[PDB]
Structure formats: structure tokens, C-alpha cells
Amino acid sequence: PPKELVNEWSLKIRKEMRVVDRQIRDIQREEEKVKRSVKDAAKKGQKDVCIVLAKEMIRSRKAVSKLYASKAHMNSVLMGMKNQLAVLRVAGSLQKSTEVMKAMQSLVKIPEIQATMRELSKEMMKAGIIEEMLEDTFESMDDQEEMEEEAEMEIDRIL
Amino acid sequence: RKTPEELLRQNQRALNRAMRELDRERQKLETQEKKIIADIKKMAKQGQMDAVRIMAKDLVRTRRYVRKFVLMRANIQAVSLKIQTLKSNNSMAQAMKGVTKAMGTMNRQLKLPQIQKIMMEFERQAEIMDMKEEMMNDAIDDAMGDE
Incomplete structure (x- = not known):
């Protein structure tokens, strides 16, 4: 299973990142100890040995930076693995959607709906001319300009 | 055998589950991101002038990933939005065929x-x-x- 192994290796990734964090913490305890030693060297007046103490100060810090880079890189590859799992699952969901897509589009097809296209077109073709014939024969009964003018005059009388 | 609408409902709510779990993963990464800014701020006063750079790279990379988790969330919802109109199209087709038959039998009179x-x-x-x-x-x- 793809999902199962991702969680396992992700939890191992954080397990090891915590070990790296512990290493950083121990080196930082030594960092504080050497900083206190530097302060002790400075007050004694032997500022010359403080140079070697500062070299000690910075070498441990370079080690800290290396460990932090290691931690960030492990985190990065972990995020990449999670990303690939998400992409794979998205593709699977798309395929599942396509399956039901085809299944439910299988019923209605182009030819039998184009037959209805033409059928409705012709039915409306006939209906329009029939309605126009009725409208024309009922409007042929009497004059329209004569009646239409009396219509506005009706509005004044009612109002 | 399964009827077409049965598969549709299952697929839609499976897509919803995928969206929800993508949201959960994004939320976890945002919590990790906040932890990252907290650690950078803690180490910024301490200094080292470079570990802040490594964690800044890690932080922008976390942002880059959450970008596309949101993107896949949108991608998943888009196909559900597409499949929603399919049943509307089918319903219109069936109703249109029915009204076409009614109009034909009306005109035949x-x-x-x-x-x-x-x-x-x-x-x-x-x-x-x-x-x-x-x-x-x-x-x-x-x-x-x-x-």
C-alpha cells in the first residue's frame, strides 16, 4: 500500500529529526559552557587566549549550522514524499470521477438527441406559423389604427 | 451492478473526503510553518547569521508546498463542479424530449x-x-x- 508506507517513513523522519535536535541541544550546552569560559578568560586579562576560545566559539556554531541544514533537508524530502502521495491520490480521484462520468453519460448519446433537436425545431416551425395565422386572421377583423387611438382616449376617461 | 446515480453520489462524497483530508494536511503544514517562524525568531536574537538563512529557505519551501496543496484542493473541487452539471444536462435532455413529444402530438391534431x-x-x-x-x-x- 502506498499510503501505509508514507506514514511509517514520515514518522521515522521526525524520529530522526528529533535526534538531530538533541544533538543540537547538547552542542548548545557545550556552547554555553565555552561562552562562560570565554568570559572568564576575558576578565583575567589574558585577552590573547580569548582568540583561541573564540575559534572554539565559532567551530561549534559551524557544527550547529551543519546539523540544522541536515534537519531542514530531511524535512524537505519528507514534504516531497507527502506531496507525491497527495498527487497520486488526486489522480486516483480523477480516474474514479471519469469512471462514473462515462457510466452516466452512456445513456444519452448524440444521435438520439439530435433527432429530438430536429423534432423540436420542426414542431416549433409549425407552431409559429399556426400562431401567426391565428393572429393575422383575428387582426384582419377590423381596423387597428382606428381602435388603437381610442385606446389612449379610454385611459383618460378611466383615470 | 450499480445504477449510474449511485456511483455519482459515492464519487462526489469521496471527492469531499479528499478535500477534507487535503485541508487537514495543509493545516498540519501551517502549524509546522508557525513553529518555523517561532524558531527563527528565537534564533534571530541569538544570531549565527546563517541558521536563520537555512530556516528561511525551509519556510519558503513550506509555503511553496502549501501553495500546491491548496491547488490540488481546487483541482479536486473543480471536477466535482464539472460533474454537477452533468445530471442537469441529462434532466434537460429528458424533459426536452418529453415536451417535444407533447408538442408533436399537439400539432398532429x-x-x-x-x-x-x-x-x-x-x-x-x-x-x-x-x-x-x-x-x-x-x-x-x-x-x-x-x-
């Missing part, structure tokens, strides 16, 4: 020729009314006269 025959008969009878009436008034007004 009175076709072109007999409606025209009704038209001519009614118009001829309207001719007859006017002829009779106007002839009557002509004759009777002529007989009365004097004014």
Missing part, C-alpha cells in the same frame, strides 16, 4: 389544411354577416328617408 379550411369558413360567414346587415340597413334607411 390540427394540421395545416383543416385549420385553413376553418379559417376560410369563418371568414366567409363573417362576409355573410356584413352583407346581410349592411343590406338591411341600406334598404330600411332608404325606405324611411326624409332626413
Whole structure:
């Protein structure tokens, strides 16, 4: 299973990142100890040995930076693995959607709906001319300009 | 065998589950991101002038990933939005076929020729009314006269 192994290796990734964090913490305890030693060297007046103490100060810090880079890189590859799992699952969901897509589009097809296209077109073709014939024969009964003018005059009388 | 609409509902809510779990993963990464800014701020005062750079790279990379988790969330919802209109199209097709059949059986009742025959008969009878009436008034007004 793809999902199962991702969680396992992700939890191992954080397990090891915590070990790296512990290493950083121990080196930082030594960092504080050497900083206190530097302060002790400075007050004694032997500022010359403080140079070697500062070299000690910075070498441990370079080690800290290396460990932090290691931690960030492990985190990065972990995020990449999670990303690939998400992409794979998205593709699977798309395929599942396509399956039901085809299944439910299988019923209605182009030819039998184009037959209805033409059928409705012709039915409306006939209906329009029939309605126009009725409208024309009922409007042929009497004059329209004569009646239409009396219509506005009706509005004044009612109002 | 499964009916087409049964598969549709399952697929839709499976997509919803995928969206929810993508949201959960994004939320976890945002919490990790906040932890990252917290650690950078803690180490910024301490210094080292470079570990802040490594964690800044890690932070922008976390942002880059959450970008596309949101993107896949949108991608998943988009196909659900597409499949929603499919049943609307099918419903319109079926209803349109039904109303087309109704219109056809309505038009088959009175076709072109007999409606025209009704038209001519009614118009001829309207001719007859006017002829009779106007002839009557002509004759009777002529007989009365004097004014």
C-alpha cells in the first residue's frame, strides 16, 4: 500500500529529526559552557587566549549550522514524499470521477438527441406559423389604427 | 451492478473526503510553518547569521508546498463542479424530449389544411354577416328617408 508506507517513513523522519535536535541541544550546552569560559578568560586579562576560545566559539556554531541544514533537508524530502502521495491520490480521484462520468453519460448519446433537436425545431416551425395565422386572421377583423387611438382616449376617461 | 446515480453520489462524497483530508494536511503544514517562524525568531536574537538563512529557505519551501496543496484542493473541487452539471444536462435532455413529444402530438391534431379550411369558413360567414346587415340597413334607411 502506498499510503501505509508514507506514514511509517514520515514518522521515522521526525524520529530522526528529533535526534538531530538533541544533538543540537547538547552542542548548545557545550556552547554555553565555552561562552562562560570565554568570559572568564576575558576578565583575567589574558585577552590573547580569548582568540583561541573564540575559534572554539565559532567551530561549534559551524557544527550547529551543519546539523540544522541536515534537519531542514530531511524535512524537505519528507514534504516531497507527502506531496507525491497527495498527487497520486488526486489522480486516483480523477480516474474514479471519469469512471462514473462515462457510466452516466452512456445513456444519452448524440444521435438520439439530435433527432429530438430536429423534432423540436420542426414542431416549433409549425407552431409559429399556426400562431401567426391565428393572429393575422383575428387582426384582419377590423381596423387597428382606428381602435388603437381610442385606446389612449379610454385611459383618460378611466383615470 | 450499480445504477449510474449511485456511483455519482459515492464519487462526489469521496471527492469531499479528499478535500477534507487535503485541508487537514495543509493545516498540519501551517502549524509546522508557525513553529518555523517561532524558531527563527528565537534564533534571530541569538544570531549565527546563517541558521536563520537555512530556516528561511525551509519556510519558503513550506509555503511553496502549501501553495500546491491548496491547488490540488481546487483541482479536486473543480471536477466535482464539472460533474454537477452533468445530471442537469441529462434532466434537460429528458424533459426536452418529453415536451417535444407533447408538442408533436399537439400539432398532429390540427394540421395545416383543416385549420385553413376553418379559417376560410369563418371568414366567409363573417362576409355573410356584413352583407346581410349592411343590406338591411341600406334598404330600411332608404325606405324611411326624409332626413
